[PDB]
Design an enzyme around this catalytic site. Structure first.
Site, PDB file in Angstrom:
ATOM      1  N   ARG A  74       0.856  -1.178   0.000  1.00 36.90           N
ATOM      2  CA  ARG A  74       0.000   0.000   0.000  1.00 36.90           C
ATOM      3  C   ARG A  74       0.898   1.236   0.000  1.00 36.90           C
ATOM      4  O   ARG A  74       0.571   2.246  -0.622  1.00 36.90           O
ATOM      5  CB  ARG A  74      -0.935  -0.001   1.219  1.00 36.90           C
ATOM      6  CG  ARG A  74      -2.022  -1.087   1.164  1.00 36.90           C
ATOM      7  CD  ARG A  74      -3.089  -0.899   2.244  1.00 36.90           C
ATOM      8  NE  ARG A  74      -2.576  -1.077   3.602  1.00 36.90           N
ATOM      9  CZ  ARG A  74      -2.429  -2.251   4.211  1.00 36.90           C
ATOM     10  NH1 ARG A  74      -2.756  -3.379   3.591  1.00 36.90           N
ATOM     11  NH2 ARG A  74      -1.959  -2.299   5.451  1.00 36.90           N
ATOM     12  N   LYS A 108     -11.252  15.382   5.009  1.00 31.24           N
ATOM     13  CA  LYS A 108     -12.409  15.008   4.215  1.00 31.24           C
ATOM     14  C   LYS A 108     -13.287  14.035   4.994  1.00 31.24           C
ATOM     15  O   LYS A 108     -12.789  13.163   5.699  1.00 31.24           O
ATOM     16  CB  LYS A 108     -11.952  14.379   2.893  1.00 31.24           C
ATOM     17  CG  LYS A 108     -13.083  14.096   1.909  1.00 31.24           C
ATOM     18  CD  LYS A 108     -13.661  12.696   2.084  1.00 31.24           C
ATOM     19  CE  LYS A 108     -12.751  11.650   1.477  1.00 31.24           C
ATOM     20  NZ  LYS A 108     -13.393  10.306   1.415  1.00 31.24           N
ATOM     21  N   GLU A 167     -18.312  16.290   2.107  1.00 36.06           N
ATOM     22  CA  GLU A 167     -18.731  15.440   1.003  1.00 36.06           C
ATOM     23  C   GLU A 167     -20.089  14.772   1.165  1.00 36.06           C
ATOM     24  O   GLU A 167     -20.203  13.728   1.813  1.00 36.06           O
ATOM     25  CB  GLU A 167     -17.688  14.347   0.728  1.00 36.06           C
ATOM     26  CG  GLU A 167     -18.034  13.510  -0.508  1.00 36.06           C
ATOM     27  CD  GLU A 167     -17.086  12.352  -0.759  1.00 36.06           C
ATOM     28  OE1 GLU A 167     -15.966  12.346  -0.205  1.00 36.06           O
ATOM     29  OE2 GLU A 167     -17.467  11.445  -1.532  1.00 36.06           O
ATOM     30  N   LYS A 184     -17.357  18.761  -1.690  1.00 43.02           N
ATOM     31  CA  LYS A 184     -16.979  17.670  -2.591  1.00 43.02           C
ATOM     32  C   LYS A 184     -18.275  16.914  -2.885  1.00 43.02           C
ATOM     33  O   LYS A 184     -18.594  15.920  -2.236  1.00 43.02           O
ATOM     34  CB  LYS A 184     -15.965  16.723  -1.940  1.00 43.02           C
ATOM     35  CG  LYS A 184     -15.550  15.563  -2.856  1.00 43.02           C
ATOM     36  CD  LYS A 184     -14.380  14.761  -2.296  1.00 43.02           C
ATOM     37  CE  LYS A 184     -14.010  13.613  -3.236  1.00 43.02           C
ATOM     38  NZ  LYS A 184     -12.763  12.918  -2.810  1.00 43.02           N
TER      39      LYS A 184
END
Lengths: 358, 358, 358, 358
Positions: free
Chosen positions: A65, A156, A197, A239
């Site tokens: 990752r 976020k 978002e 977003k």
């Protein structure tokens, strides 16, 4: 005639958030709304990485990752198109090949490090079956502050809304809006510009008109909640999903139509002060993501805010394929990534040329 | 899993007003947001003319009120600076020199005729002493439909908010917002573009920051109510107060400060789709009204909407004195009116020059 | 840090209505919640009188309408069962056979005179087709003050909700609640105890569960609005529909079932302080109105408020037929009226016997 | 015009919580509202015991805290006055003398075991300085389900409101109400009857009228939030503060006055369906708690709900002293505990005699 002396903060008209980070939040917003640039969303969960790696035969391990994120972040010159990167919790503590932690690596190159702070989706337990809420507010300031000390300057949080039978429950509309609003306030108090978002999911057979109606309804309540919580508008970003027909509708929408519906919906709900709107790519293809953003930035409708991108798969797909999880694939992977970043940079400026993707 | 078939109109997300006049409303808005033009507010009450005519020794009669309006309405060339006129109920039925009713006269000259449809201020009877609500919703559609048939294509409704002790009651904030929102819907259903006027009065010793905080609070709720009632944003206009210090505060704000505070407040509350904002002059001098509007149209802050004027005294004061209520004074009166109209036309364009003014 | 002196009335927690009529309103509520007594609703519009008169061949004239009211109001002995009478505007000024105005006549005989103050139903123009709002708030205090001077001490205002496709629009739910709440406040300020009537109509093919869900939803918002407007709970009454299956459903409902559903719904929505609930008869037969009220007053569910009746047709149907609009029918008409009044008085006491109605 | 088939659960009027535990929640409420019985609150934190055990010279250790709870939990015959016990997380896992976990032990004695599920107070970060929120919703169902498996059948969650300058911020009023409402829904979905505690703290120099105004305002919003979240009223309980003057006001209210203010405030805000109100005694002496509860249960005001106690210190204070943390004190400590329990049992019945106490 009875008069009483109270704290100004106890009066409804004086509820704007007060934080010593205001100037810095504003400065961060300025960096994130740089012409020709957008955000790279690299905050995929471990489970999402499994899906990303399956096609290229890469085992899902911490080291793999790290290499996956390094493929994109260490691509020379990406800062020309990317103003900020949304990182996953794990990645914030990992290091690039040069010894710099990823946040340090980004900051050194003028790119703002961001962090996904929500703790995932859970059943709403109210409203309709299939609707989901988002967890993560408990202990939020403690987590956010730790991220801030590591270099993150924005965050976020994602809430989802599922269109079923052409609608969504009011329980979901109200509850998720309140969650997003509280998240925004806690983020600003912690020194992180919040990217709000509210994703109306593309899943479903609904047409574009239904997406438009539901999106306007969902976003209007998100704004209402933000107003009630006293968010600093100058220090936050949105977003949202673009307004498009459902993924299983079998219908198509010209970029011009998507732009009209999307810009119209944002204008009917968003305060003119909102600094920027960074679209999620959701179930859009890499090319559609660029075409739609370009059309949006050519719309004659009102749009005072910076309109750009905050893409994940739409910026990573081809790069991952070209990389193949091999060191020998880094060059090809990075060329693919920079190409998509460039296309979206051009789209932000409204100068994207479809012939460039041929 | 119980399912049920309902009318789309019964779902919260499908509450946008449906009117056959939508296209016409938008067409009218386009006319009212013509670059370099503003609105003339000539909807003063019959009673108010008693004191207004006092200085010029003019008896307050119907015929004299007709002549008062004709002074401006029949001033050749004013259509270069005025896109619409807010008429008083009485004037709608009065005639110009050529025999046409004022609405017919104005329409023939490219000026949109409007009508003030509210029925005055009354005690709120909730909240704080001194607060007022506005009456007029009963039988509204019947009245509006009649005005429409006479030629009117837009209307105006005024609600006021009084700052006392640096605040206003929530009772007033909620109730007046709901009144304004219902008014907008009934107007659009009747074919009249509604001008929504939520005036935070200049009266008081409060400073500019207090006006800013109260105005933001009041306007935010007006927008919330409009959203709940499903107003057609593309077909309405706002007529707000500018953000300035109280009339008895002992302070006078510089044009740039008024512009900053006013545009910032509008941007934090108004949806980007709002087509236009026509400022009221309240207790500003004729020159201040021009200076302030000019600064507003030179602001670097977000402002997608058309920013112009909807002035009463700020356009009529000097003209009235020069006219003196005599036919021989029409030439002088009109030169004064056209001058002020020109000054504000230039202010709308952001090209106002103080030196060109007295 | 920042402290400010404001009016207590500007603080949200001190919004309870302030009126010098409070003690009198409470005294009137006491009279209207007397065991064994209910309200006679005789406020039928001129148009409704036409429908009432057609079957008996009586022309709809002012004098015949006066005789229609006299049939009931001068039926000596009805006072034992009726604590108040809701009069129509026209009747307030008419005289009894002894020369007294009806309000004077009623007051002198131990009955409280009341008045229907709403100005009728009108298209909602929001929500779903068929939904209606109620007009009458403009100039309300002036009208109410005049009725008070004539002897009226309570009033009634009716809003309706139409169940279509098993639901009602949020637009109707919110707007009509707001109307009722404002009406309650203006009434209390004018010295009249307000009877708040949010009638979920029996019209339709819906079942009892649907009526239950819609009624609970509608009533909950009415309560919410009353709380926001700061109503004096100890000085108001509710006049709701009972919870029953739709008139065109073809379904039956046992008295005990109606009682369970009705009392349960009231308990889930009404504050325990509400002094009384006077049910409307709507589309129920004379016997059903009595049977249902009786069962309600034998319910084991929570019900701190006085539960009685405010019936129109349920008390007048048989009397009108026996009367036949003729002097020779007054005796038979009054015998029928008194019988129904007695049956409902018994029902209020929970001692109604179906056998008494043959 | 257009029709659409949706899920009933997507309609606003059908938002009532749906849980297979409804019947059991109602059965549990019946047990908790047993005449002559109240709740024992033994949910004090581990840290608080340090200062609590200081006076008796008992070190604060897991074992000693177990003995502290065993003092009253294993007291013979206390089930005659206690219907349920609010346990601390730690205690749920501890064992009684016979080896049974306390939940199993209590269940065997017919006493319902409960658990405090909130995760503590934290800065609100909105509103006025000093205001606090309550955390714990994240991962709530998982924790609640575990407690249910261990035998717990009801729970408690506490939110506080601080009266400052005679008021509280709307930010706190709204946010804490929403928190309590969401908590109630999650609890019912998990099979635990929720005890909603909106505590307006006694701290401050405010008088009784101020506590009344704030309590009514705070509680009305809690009810509003509960209605919006669709709580099962039949399966929840309230744990509010009594309406009394501030601890530092220098005034002490008489039992009859506290009863009037408290019962009046509950009636004006609580729906009649609310099954029970279990008062907290924070700030009151062991005697006052009994006198006040007794007066409340002798009030002529409306009160359909079971009015009892949910005391901690007011039930343990004297017992702790007589116990001294020694084995030789159990006998005496339990005599003092059973005494206070008996006194409050009588108070619940309104048959409390001050002569029975000092």
């Amino acid at each position: 005639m009875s008069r009483v002396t109270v704290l100004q903060s106890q009066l409804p008209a004086y509820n704007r958030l007060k934080t010593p980070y205001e100037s810095e939040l504003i400065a961060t917003v300025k960096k994130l709304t740089t012409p020709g640039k957008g955000l790279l969303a690299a905050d995929e969960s471990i489970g999402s990485c499994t899906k990303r790696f399956q096609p290229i035969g890469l085992s899902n391990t911490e080291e793999h990752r790290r290499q996956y994120r390094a493929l994109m972040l260490e691509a020379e010159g990406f800062e020309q198109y990317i103003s900020g990167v949304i990182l996953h919790d794990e990645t914030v503590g990992q290091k690039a090949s040069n010894g710099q932690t990823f946040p340090e690596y980004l900051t050194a190159r003028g790119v703002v490090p961001g962090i996904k702070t929500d703790m995932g989706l859970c059943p709403l337990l109210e409203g309709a079956e299939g609707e989901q809420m988002t967890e993560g507010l408990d202990g939020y300031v403690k987590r956010a502050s730790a991220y801030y000390k590591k270099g993150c300057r924005f965050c976020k949080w994602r809430n989802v809304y599922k269109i079923q039978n052409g609608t969504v429950s009011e329980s979901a509309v109200r509850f998720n809006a309140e969650t997003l609003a509280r998240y925004a306030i806690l983020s600003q108090m912690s020194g992180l510009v919040p990217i709000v978002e509210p994703e109306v999911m593309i899943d479903g057979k609904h047409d574009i008109d239904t997406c438009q109606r539901v999106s306007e309804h969902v976003w209007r309540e998100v704004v209402a909640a933000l107003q009630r919580h006293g968010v600093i508008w100058e220090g936050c970003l949105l977003k949202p999903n673009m307004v498009v027909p459902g993924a299983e509708s079998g219908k198509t929408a010209a970029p011009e139509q998507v732009a009209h519906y999307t810009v119209m919906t944002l204008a009917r709900t968003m305060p003119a002060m909102l600094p920027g709107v960074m679209f999620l790519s959701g179930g859009l293809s890499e090319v559609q993501a660029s075409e739609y953003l370009n059309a949006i930035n050519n719309s004659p409708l009102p749009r005072p805010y910076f309109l750009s991108f905050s893409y994940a798969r739409a910026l990573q797909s081809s790069a991952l394929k070209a990389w193949g999880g091999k060191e020998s694939g880094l060059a090809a992977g990075r060329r693919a990534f920079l190409h998509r970043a460039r296309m979206n940079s051009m789209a932000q400026l409204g100068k994207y040329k479809r012939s460039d993707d041929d």
